[PDB]
Amino acid sequence: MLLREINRYCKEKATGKRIYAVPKLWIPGFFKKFDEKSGRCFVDPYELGAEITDWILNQSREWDYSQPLSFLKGEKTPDWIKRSVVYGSLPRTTAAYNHKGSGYYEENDVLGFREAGTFFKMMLLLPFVKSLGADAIYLLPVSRMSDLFKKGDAPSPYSVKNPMELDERYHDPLLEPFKVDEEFKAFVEACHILGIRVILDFIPRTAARDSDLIREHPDWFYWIKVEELADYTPPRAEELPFKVPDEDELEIIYNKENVKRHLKKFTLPPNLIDPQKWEKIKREEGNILELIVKEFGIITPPGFSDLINDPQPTWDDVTFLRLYLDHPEASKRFLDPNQPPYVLYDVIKASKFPGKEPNRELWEYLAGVIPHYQKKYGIDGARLDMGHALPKELLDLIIKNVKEYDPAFVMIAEELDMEKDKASKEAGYDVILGSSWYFAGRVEEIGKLPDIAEELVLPFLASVETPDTPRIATRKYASKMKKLAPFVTYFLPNSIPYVNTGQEIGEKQPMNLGLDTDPNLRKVLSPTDEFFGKLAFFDHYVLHWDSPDRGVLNFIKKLIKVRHEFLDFVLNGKFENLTTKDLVMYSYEKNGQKIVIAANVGKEPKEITGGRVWNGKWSDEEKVVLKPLEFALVVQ
Amino acid sequence: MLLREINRYCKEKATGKRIYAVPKLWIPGFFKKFDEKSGRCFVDPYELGAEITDWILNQSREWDYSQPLSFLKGEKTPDWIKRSVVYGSLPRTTAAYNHKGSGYYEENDVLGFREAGTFFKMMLLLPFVKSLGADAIYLLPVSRMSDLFKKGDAPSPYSVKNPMELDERYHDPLLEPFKVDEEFKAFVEACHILGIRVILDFIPRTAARDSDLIREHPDWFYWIKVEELADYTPPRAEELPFKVPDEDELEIIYNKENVKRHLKKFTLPPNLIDPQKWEKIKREEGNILELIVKEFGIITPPGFSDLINDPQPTWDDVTFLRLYLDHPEASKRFLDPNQPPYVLYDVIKASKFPGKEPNRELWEYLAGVIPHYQKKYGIDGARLDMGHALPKELLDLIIKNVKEYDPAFVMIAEELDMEKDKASKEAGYDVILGSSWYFAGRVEEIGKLPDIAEELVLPFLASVETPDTPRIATRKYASKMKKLAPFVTYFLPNSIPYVNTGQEIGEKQPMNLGLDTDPNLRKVLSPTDEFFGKLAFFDHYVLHWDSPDRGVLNFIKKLIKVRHEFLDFVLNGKFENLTTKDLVMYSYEKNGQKIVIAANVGKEPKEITGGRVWNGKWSDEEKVVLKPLEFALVVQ
Numbered sequence A, B: 001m002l003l004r005e006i007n008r009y010c011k012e013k014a015t016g017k018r019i020y021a022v023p024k025l026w027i028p029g030f031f032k033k034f035d036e037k038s039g040r041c042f043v044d045p046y047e048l049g050a051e052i053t054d055w056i057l058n059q060s061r062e063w064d065y066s067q068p069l070s071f072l073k074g075e076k077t078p079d080w081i082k083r084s085v086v087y088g089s090l091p092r093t094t095a096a097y098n099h100k101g102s103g104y105y106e107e108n109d110v111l112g113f114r115e116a117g118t119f120f121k122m123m124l125l126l127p128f129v130k131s132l133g134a135d136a137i138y139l140l141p142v143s144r145m146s147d148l149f150k151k152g153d154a155p156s157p158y159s160v161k162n163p164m165e166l167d168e169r170y171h172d173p174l175l176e177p178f179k180v181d182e183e184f185k186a187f188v189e190a191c192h193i194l195g196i197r198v199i200l201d202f203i204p205r206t207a208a209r210d211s212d213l214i215r216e217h218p219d220w221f222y223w224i225k226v227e228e229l230a231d232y233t234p235p236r237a238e239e240l241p242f243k244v245p246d247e248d249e250l251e252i253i254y255n256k257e258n259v260k261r262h263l264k265k266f267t268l269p270p271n272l273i274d275p276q277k278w279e280k281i282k283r284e285e286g287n288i289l290e291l292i293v294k295e296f297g298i299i300t301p302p303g304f305s306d307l308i309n310d311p312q313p314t315w316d317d318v319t320f321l322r323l324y325l326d327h328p329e330a331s332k333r334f335l336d337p338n339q340p341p342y343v344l345y346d347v348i349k350a351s352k353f354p355g356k357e358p359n360r361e362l363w364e365y366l367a368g369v370i371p372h373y374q375k376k377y378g379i380d381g382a383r384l385d386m387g388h389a390l391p392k393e394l395l396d397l398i399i400k401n402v403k404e405y406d407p408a409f410v411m412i413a414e415e416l417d418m419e420k421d422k423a424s425k426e427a428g429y430d431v432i433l434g435s436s437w438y439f440a441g442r443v444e445e446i447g448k449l450p451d452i453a454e455e456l457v458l459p460f461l462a463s464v465e466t467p468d469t470p471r472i473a474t475r476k477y478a479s480k481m482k483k484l485a486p487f488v489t490y491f492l493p494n495s496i497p498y499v500n501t502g503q504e505i506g507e508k509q510p511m512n513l514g515l516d517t518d519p520n521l522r523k524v525l526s527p528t529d530e531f532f533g534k535l536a537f538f539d540h541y542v543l544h545w546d547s548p549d550r551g552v553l554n555f556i557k558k559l560i561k562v563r564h565e566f567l568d569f570v571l572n573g574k575f576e577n578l579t580t581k582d583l584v585m586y587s588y589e590k591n592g593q594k595i596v597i598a599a600n601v602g603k604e605p606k607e608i609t610g611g612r613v614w615n616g617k618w619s620d621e622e623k624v625v626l627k628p629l630e631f632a633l634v635v636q
């Protein structure tokens, strides 16, 4: 058993030399073998790894923890997610730390340590994650990432070079005798033993510009002449609306001169251009895309939004997969015969403009990616990205295969529109991402959340921030909102509390400027901060474990614990909205008992019925006076 | 002849495919083979390289341009520097550009291009440099750099891993058939043909933490126990002044408990610790320092200032060379017998606290580094860094060897104190760095420059900014000072006009926060600027060639040209200071003629005698009225 094999190894390597730095919050209460200098602590990584793996292994019964927890629990439905508390993480960032204990962070240092996040360090953090009250860890893509077309010194986890392989960088040199796939398997075993479920992330529609799939399936990709790389951009039609074009608009679009030049930038796959040349390079050493560019003078194109007139820039680190062998049915009557496969708004949203010939071999591969993870490591659920673009038949196959192996498997839709819950449910999903963080961060918008949640037909991840948005600690009235926002949000109907990595220590710097973000957030840190201006998605970044917001850390732990103490109300009580202009408020009544969630977002204090009151601490008073930006849970 | 060999190769590879992006300012007037899209231009790198090398080769006579220009001119003195105009550059930055023409910069891209600066691109820029009026190019260290203990994704040019080798990264993959040493030699040949002198930079006192010199001379370095790495810092003595300690202070220092713990952190070289082990690893593959740390558990220490109580942080990317075999003479009576070699304020300034046993073999090596460059590539001069710390005998040997080979060779002292000119001259130097940029950027300080320059006994580099200071374009009243400051400065007595790379296009972002810098300068660029927050010394950085300050570019060219038109006055005219509170002014009289340099830094306009007046343009008026922050050169 790998987790035990790793424990055995650590005990073997133990030496007592404390030269590996970790922030004090990473040291568990039971661990005493460490030196403390300058705020941080030093340990023998093997003693820390041995004692924490012991702590974990001692709680194991004698089942096989390499399969989904649902198996050990005998569950046949994804109902468990409704009682879970999720911690979201980009392992590379969550577990990054300068182990030298001085100077600047380095991906790998002279002492032999990998300061970047590893699956082994994610294991060491398990006691910390568990202390937050989380019982499910959601991870951003950990598949092999492409190192081409990067925006910084680190690749985006969404630039997937191989869906079936984990990125070797998650391997930790401390565990030389082990392989990355084994470290991950061990990581999931440790989670399962602790009752923690694992949810991964996949993006079927796209691939890295130099995807490993190119050598054996060069025809599953699109190609353009290198000469056309520099000015390759989505052809605009300013007279038309900013949106995904409909059928009628296509006729207009296809007659525009700029679209016609666009269509002419494409070529046939390298295998169909020079069969002999292909075979030659196809079996050559070096980056496959660099070989194709040099030998054939063609390259995969960068991706771009499927909405016409979208002002966002092209996605240079990814490209689209060829979902159909033929061009979209409704567009064929506008193409010159012999038109090679091309990318345009319609081809991207295959769900709306499909061809008559599905690329079955690709479809099968795609529908076998998650099951490969369920069977190999026993993951418990997954988030599917860009599902809007997938044909219904391909999405159905993908879900059938995972549910076939484990009917308790939770499928999470990357659906930000909380009004699209009905459609997501109809698509086969079990949970929706939603956009609660947008309202939770605005005093003038937070009161809309109660009705929004109540109307859902699927549970949602109740977040106050995600990897793509600004941190809650940087929103207006942050000092108050960093506690008020999660309180109101985590208690909503149909909620699955979500804790974003770093949120628990009041992290300010955003990880990415994706959704609802302002470039000025790039400068919330001090110009003297080693990580000033850096975005975790594209650059090496270490969260501020050495200077955490302890007030937020403590409140979050207590909030999750109290919320769980009353979980039965949230899940089965009768809900009633009591929100007013100045007061966001609602209640849950059950078996004659009732709890009330309240938060004052007005300019003047307000009073409400008392009883036993919680606001971080428990008190008892008949009346509760909520000054502006104060809140409380009232138990009557 | 390498320059011709490279020209031959470019013509061979020429194909006419324009996919290599360069900013329009890089295209010479004579070059027409380029496409222009989105502000930037695209070329076939081989056609650009062929036509520019042709342009250069066509101006060559039939001499050997691989030796110093002084040889071809028959000069026996370094007098030429007094008539020169210097362009200062960090090739890695000056010649960096995203050749894909879209997306984000990459050290090396999928098209096969090296976007980082290369000696081949420095050759292509030669027509541009020449258009500025510069006739000498000064380069920051281009020796092989260490990749350990970096502050960003790029190494500091001062982290010298091998003084005798050029860093392989300056090689350009376009010239596959050539070696880096050949590209550099060719670069210097092209400069010499164009009349441009080459000045390099060396730092004898220090070395990278993992210097290549370690395998054969592990004993030329200091060593400390890894266990002591994290808290290794210069022992403070707050009761003592912030300065380099004198003799008396040493007795106190050596009796402090913290200094005593410091002394105990050191060990003997790995060769003296385990002779057999050394021989084993000494012949192993891998980073020599990583092997030593793992096998012996010791490491070279990071450097630090020789001034006690200095608030600056340790220099983790460099370490000190062992200049003496014994401990400093004046400190021996304070050491425990068997004290291994250690680093302390006194050991660092070997010039002040020397031992009785010079490390002759090291001294010889050091004194052979520059001559290796003179003989191999024919460089014309050099700047020596940290000369304050070198024993007089070692500095004398170093200068004797270069002067022995070429008596016209120019030695530049890294001396910022313009009052230390007499001492620098007495040390054997020919030029001093000085600190004019500090006064030139302050309206309340600029008037002191005239007397300061006049008193010099050696010429100085008249700069308004250097790689270590803020850009002149970010000082107060920048829009005016970016032209007024260089005007006043370039005409000073004993001046050698200095143009900092990027200054010519009004660059704002600093390259380094070294001298006189404020961390807030780190944010002068837009948060949307791809290079926001980056410092060229430690990170990949591309100057803003695509959005240059054309007004500054033009003025600088005209200023250097007019200054040279009157060079005889500056060099041989009689100087007279005429500066007042509100008016910085001075004159040069020669052969009955006189020119006057004037700049109004007051709050009210001022009038002065006219004649033929230059202020960017030539005019003729009997009286000149200088409003605040206006200037003029008056020819009477």
Ligand SMILES: OC[C@H]1O[C@H](O[C@H]2[C@H](O)[C@@H](O)[C@@H](O)O[C@@H]2CO)[C@H](O)[C@@H](O)[C@@H]1O
Pocket (backbone or CB within 6 Å): A156, A157, A158, A159, A203, A315, A316, A317, A318, A385, A386, A414, A468, A512, A514, A537
């Ligand atoms: O490298 C692809 C893409 O990654 C990021 O965007 C992600 C986003 O964070 C996910 O939540 C999901 O929506 O997929 C997106 C891309 O598929 C970066 O923000 C983006 O710049 C980058 O191109």
Ligand SMILES: OC[C@H]1O[C@H](O[C@H]2[C@H](O)[C@@H](O)[C@@H](O)O[C@@H]2CO)[C@H](O)[C@@H](O)[C@@H]1O
Pocket (backbone or CB within 6 Å): B156, B157, B158, B159, B203, B315, B316, B317, B318, B385, B386, B414, B468, B512, B514, B537
């Ligand atoms: O890596 C050494 C050091 O390099 C830089 O400082 C240079 C400085 O720029 C030079 O002008 C000269 O004074 O030598 C210095 C170091 O020898 C960086 O500023 C510094 O952080 C770094 O440690």
Ligand SMILES: OC[C@H]1O[C@H](O)[C@H](O)[C@@H](O)[C@@H]1O
Pocket (backbone or CB within 6 Å): A386, A387, A388, A389, A395, A413, A414, A415, A420, A423, A424, A427
């Ligand atoms: O399966 C992908 C898509 O299916 C449905 O269209 C849902 O409305 C949407 O939320 C989901 O992303």
Ligand SMILES: OC[C@H]1O[C@H](O)[C@H](O)[C@@H](O)[C@@H]1O
Pocket (backbone or CB within 6 Å): B386, B387, B388, B389, B395, B413, B414, B415, B420, B423, B424, B427
């Ligand atoms: O040779 C190194 C040093 O020599 C003299 O001390 C000079 O005063 C100083 O400017 C120089 O740096």
